[PDB]
C-alpha cells in the first residue's frame, strides 16, 4: 500500500512521528502568546497587536489559558507518549500493540480538539489549573479528561511490551530504557488518579449541568495529587533521553545503569505524595500534613541531584575521551556544534538555578515568601520551558532522521544552534526578570501592563522581561522556519532513517548485578508507591469528604 512502505515493518515510527508533530504544533501555538506575556511582565501591552494579528483572543487571560494548556499540558503530554513508547519499543526491537497505539493518538486529538474549541471561543478561560469555582465550558473538561485518559492507553501499551519481552526472556533483567518507561507509566498511573477523580467526581457533573457546585478545597486537593507528579511526568522523558542517549551524542558512555534505575525508582516512590507543597497557603489543611509533604518534597529533590552527578560525570568522561584536559578541558571538547547535544545540555544548565528555586518553594514557611508571585513562573520556565522543552527540541536532530528518513542539511543544523542558543539566553534573561520581580511582590497571572504605575520597584526586572520578550519572539520564529523547513522538505535520503536511535553504552560494574536485580522488583515498589499515596493524601481526603461544601461556579471573564 506504501511507497514509503516503512509502516508494515516499523509502523511505530508512524505513530511516534504523528504524536510528536502534535506536541510541536501545540508548542508552536501556545508559545505564540508567551512573548506577549513576556512584554506584559515587561510592562508593555502587546495585546493591541496580538489582538489584531490573531483576532479571536479576547483577554490576556485566554492567552495565558492557551499558552498554559497547550504548552504545558498538551505539548509535554504528546512528547512523553512519543518518547516513553518509541524508545522502550526499540531497545526491545519489539512492535507496540499498534491497534491501541492509534487509539492512543486518536483519543489525544479528539480530546485536544473537543477541548480546544471552547478555548478559542473564550468559553473556558479558567487557566491550565481550572481551579473551581471559576467555571469552564463542559467541552473543556470532557475534552481534557479524555486527552489525559489517552495516557492510560499508553500505560497499557508499554506494559504490553514489558509483559511479552519477559515471555521471550525468562531470568533476564529489564533493559534500562524499557525499565525506565515501566516505572514511569506506573508512576503516572498512581499520579493520574487525582485529576481523574476530580474530573469524574466533580468537574464533569458540575459543568454538564448535573450539579450546582464543587467544594473548592477538595477540587484543588484532587487537582494537586496529579498536578505535581505531572511535572515529573514532563521531565522524565527528557531524563530517559539525557541518561541513555545524550552521553553517546556527547562522545561517550553513561557511567551507571544502576544509578539511572535508582533515580527512576525514586520518582515512582516520591513523585505523587507531595502535592501539598502546592497548598502551603491553603486553608483547612493541617500544618503537620503540609510539613510532611514538605519533608517528602525534599526527598524527591534527591533523585534529581544524584542525576546531576551521574549525568555531569558522563559528559565529563566523554569530555576527556575527545581529548579534554583541564578542570574544564572536558567541557569545550564536547560537540558544541550539535543541536542534539547543545539543547538538553543548555537546558540542564538553567536546571541548576531552577532546582534551587523548587527547593525554596518546597520549604513550607519559605513558600509564604514567594507563593503566587512571578517567582514561580521563574522556577517553572527554567524547568519545563527550558529543560524538558530544549531536550525535546534537540531531539529533532536525531528522532526526525530516525522517523522520517529526512536528514539535517548543514544549514538547518546551523539554524538549530542559533535557536537553541537564542531560546536558552532568552529563558535565562526571562528567569532573572521573573524571579526578581517575583521577590518585589509582583503577583502572577496578571495583566500588570494594564496597571502600569503599580509596580514602581519592578522597573529594572521589567526590562529583562521586555528583552527576553523580543529574544524568545525571535527565537520562536527561527524555530518555526526551521521546524517547517526540516519537514517541508521532499529530499529524504532514509539510509539514516532505518538507522537506530543513538543509545549509549553503559559502563558496567560488578555491583550492577545484585543491586539492579533488587530495583527490578517492579510490582512490589509500585505497591509501596500506592502505600505512600494512601498514607499521604489519606487522612486528608478522609476529612474533606466527611465535610464537603460545594459552592456555585462563576464565570468572571
Amino acid at each position: 500500500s506504501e511507497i514509503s512502505r516503512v509502516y508494515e515493518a516499523y509502523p511505530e515510527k508512524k505513530a511516534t512521528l504523528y504524536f510528536l508533530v502534535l506536541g510541536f504544533l501545540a508548542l508552536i501555538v501556545g508559545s505564540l502568546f508567551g512573548p506577549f506575556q513576556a512584554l506584559n511582565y515587561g510592562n508593555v501591552d502587546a495585546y493591541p497587536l496580538l489582538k489584531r494579528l490573531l483576532p479571536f483572543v479576547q483577554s490576556y487571560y485566554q492567552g495565558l489559558t492557551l499558552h498554559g494548556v497547550l504548552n504545558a499540558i498538551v505539548f509535554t503530554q504528546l512528547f512523553a507518549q512519543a518518547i516513553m513508547v518509541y524508545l522502550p519499543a526499540r531497545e526491545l526491537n519489539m512492535r507496540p500493540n499498534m491497534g491501541l497505539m492509534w487509539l492512543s493518538w486518536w483519543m489525544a486529538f479528539i480530546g485536544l480538539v473537543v477541548a480546544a474549541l471552547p478555548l478559542l471561543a473564550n468559553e473556558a478561560t479558567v487557566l491550565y489549573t481550572f481551579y473551581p469555582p471559576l467555571k469552564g465550558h463542559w467541552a473543556f473538561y470532557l475534552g481534557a479528561s479524555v486527552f489525559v485518559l489517552s495516557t492510560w492507553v499508553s500505560i497499557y501499551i508499554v506494559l504490553d511490551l514489558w509483559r511479552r519481552w519477559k515471555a521471550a526472556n525468562p531470568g533476564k533483567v529489564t533493559p534500562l530504557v524499557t525499565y525506565m518507561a515501566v516505572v514511569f507509566w506506573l508512576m503516572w498511573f498512581l499520579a493520574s488518579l487525582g485529576l481523574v477523580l476530580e474530573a469524574v467526581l466533580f468537574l464533569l457533573p458540575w459543568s454538564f449541568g448535573l450539579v450546582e457546585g464543587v467544594d473548592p478545597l477538595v477540587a484543588r486537593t484532587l487537582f494537586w495529587w496529579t498536578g505535581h507528579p505531572i511535572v515529573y511526568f514532563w521531565l522524565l522523558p527528557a531524563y530517559a533521553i539525557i541518561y541513555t542517549i545524550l552521553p553517546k551524542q556527547a562522545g561517550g558512555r553513561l557511567v551507571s545503569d544502576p544509578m539511572a534505575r535508582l533515580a527512576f525508582l525514586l520518582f515512582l516512590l516520591l513523585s505523587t505524595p507531595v502535592g501539598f507543597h502546592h497548598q502551603f497557603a491553603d486553608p483547612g489543611i493541617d500544618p503537620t500534613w503540609k510539613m510532611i509533604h514538605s519533608v517528602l518534597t525534599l526527598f524527591v529533590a534527591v533523585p534529581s541531584l544524584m542525576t546531576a552527578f551521574t549525568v555531569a560525570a558522563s559528559l565529563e568522561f566523554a569530555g576527556r575521551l575527545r581529548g579534554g584536559r583541564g578542570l574544564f578541558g572536558w567541557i569545550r571538547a564536547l560537540p558544541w556544534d550539535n543541536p542534539a547535544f547543545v539543547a538538553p545540555v543548555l537546558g540542564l544548565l538553567g536546571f541548576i538555578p531552577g532546582g534551587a528555586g523548587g527547593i525554596v518553594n518546597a520549604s513550607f514557611t519559605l513558600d509564604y515568601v514567594v507563593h503566587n508571585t512571578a517567582w514561580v513562573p521563574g522556577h517553572f520556565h527554567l524547568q519545563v520551558a527550558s529543560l524538558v522543552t530544549l531536550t525535546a527540541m534537540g531531539s529533532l536532530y536525531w528522532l526526525l532522521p530516525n522517523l522520517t528518513g529526512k536528514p539535517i542539511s548543514d544549514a538547518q543544523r546551523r539554524l538549530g544552534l542559533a535557536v537553541v542558543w537564542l531560546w536558552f539566553l532568552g529563558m535565562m534573561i526571562m528567569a532573572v526578570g521573573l524571579h526578581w520581580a517575583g521577590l518585589l511582590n509582583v503577583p502572577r497571572r496578571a495583566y500588570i501592563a494594564q496597571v502600569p504605575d503599580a509596580y514602581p520597584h519592578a522597573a529594572v526586572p521589567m526590562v529583562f522581561n521586555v528583552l527576553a520578550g523580543i529574544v524568545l519572539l525571535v527565537a520562536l520564529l527561527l524555530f518555526i522556519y526551521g521546524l517547517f523547513s526540516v519537514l517541508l522538505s521532499r529530499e529524504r535520503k532514509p539510509e539514516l532513517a532505518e538507522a537506530p536511535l543513538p543509545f549509549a553504552e553503559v559502563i558496567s560494574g560488578p555491583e550492577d548485578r545484585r543491586l539492579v536485580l533488587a530495583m527490578d522488583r517492579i510490582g512490589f515498589w509500585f505497591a509501596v508507591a500506592a502505600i505512600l499515596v494512601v498514607l499521604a493524601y489519606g487522612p486528608t481526603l478522609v476529612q474533606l469528604f466527611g465535610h464537603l461544601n460545594p459552592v456555585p461556579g462563576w464565570r468572571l471573564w
Binding site: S256, K290, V302, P443, R445, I507, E511, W554, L556
Partner: protein, 166 residues
Amino acid sequence: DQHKAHKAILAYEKGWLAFSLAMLFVFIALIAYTLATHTAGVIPAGKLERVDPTTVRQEGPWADPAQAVVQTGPNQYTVYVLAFAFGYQPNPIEVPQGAEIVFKITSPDVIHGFHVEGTNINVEVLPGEVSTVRYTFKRPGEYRIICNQYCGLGHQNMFGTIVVKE
C-alpha cells in the same frame, strides 16, 4: 579508565547522596525552626472553618464592614475580611501596630489571594471557607494588599490596603 572509573564513581555518588541528605536536613531543621517561633503565625488555620459564600456578605461578621475589626485579647484583634470579585472589604483595614492581628478571610465568589505586601501574610482565599492567619504588625504605616490568584477579569486590579496605625 573503563572499570577503574566505575568504582570511583560509585563511591563518589555515595559521598554526594550523603552530603545532599545532611544539607537537606539542616534545611528541615531550619524550616522547623521557623515553625516554632512567632513567624509561623502566617500558616493557615488547619481546622476546617465552613461558611456560605452566598450569605457571607449579608449575614455574619463579614456582612457589616464597620464591624470587621473585633478586639479579642488585651492585645488581640480579629479582622474579618472579604475578598470578592475585585476588591477587599474593609478598605482600608485599620489595625494598631504592636498588636496580634488575626485575619479571618473568605469569599462570596471564586478564590482570590491575600498577599499583604511586605510580610509573609500570603493566604489563599477560598469560597466556602475561612482562612485564618496571625500577624503582628511591627512597624506602622501602609501595607498594600495584592490579590495573587487569578479570580477572573478584574484580577490585575484587585488590591486593598492595610493601615497599621502609629
